[PDB]
């Protein structure tokens, strides 16, 4: 049948963890989760973001395990956290995104396209300001916009980009 102390303890710990998620127990989650370590980890990812004490690391580790082999559930999440967190150097993230897409050919490509768009917006206002210059940044911004346009292709979004270019 059920284990003497060990099986019952695990079940009770899981129940307690569920109760902690229902009611935030930053402390309960920290000790309950530790006891629970003895797939899955969304609650662990959730507790770090819900109760902080910088919640980005655990998700990265989870995403890293079980790679070799719709799409992957661990991952499509990790990517979203990144852009929102950014909202350190981003280029790097964009590079990582490309790498993932290369390895695996909801499409990640859409997420990658969205990420560049954020950079363009920052570029658009910085360029608009006088402190007064004619080429450089404007040409760079135009190139970025074209690149963003290509990825989406292969209405609201397009409209937004256009507005952005005009302001710049």
């Amino acid at each position: 049948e059920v284990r003497n102390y060990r099986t019952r303890h695990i079940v009770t710990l899981t129940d307690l963890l569920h109760l902690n998620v229902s009611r935030h127990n930053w402390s309960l989650a920290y000790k309950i989760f530790a006891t629970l370590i003895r797939s899955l980890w969304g609650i662990g990812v959730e507790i770090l973001d819900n109760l902080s004490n910088g919640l980005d690391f655990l998700q990265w580790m989870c995403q890293i395990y079980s790679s070799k082999s719709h799409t992957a559930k661990f991952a499509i999440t990790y990517l979203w956290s990144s852009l929102i967190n950014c909202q350190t150097e981003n280029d790097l993230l964009q590079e990582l995104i490309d790498k993932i897409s290369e390895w695996v050919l909801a499409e990640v490509w859409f997420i990658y396209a969205s990420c560049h768009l954020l950079k363009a917006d920052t570029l658009s206002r910085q360029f608009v300001n006088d402190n007064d210059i004619k080429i450089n940044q404007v040409i760079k911004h135009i190139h970025y916009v074209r690149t963003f346009l290509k990825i989406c292709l292969d209405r609201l979004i397009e409209n937004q980009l256009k507005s952005f270019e005009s302001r710049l």
Partner: peptide
């Protein structure tokens, strides 16, 4: 279940 109950009891005792 019995084991769990026992554990709970023990915990309670400890608390007391």
């Amino acid at each position: 279940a019995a084991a769990a109950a026992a554990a709970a009891a023990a915990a309670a005792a400890a608390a007391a």
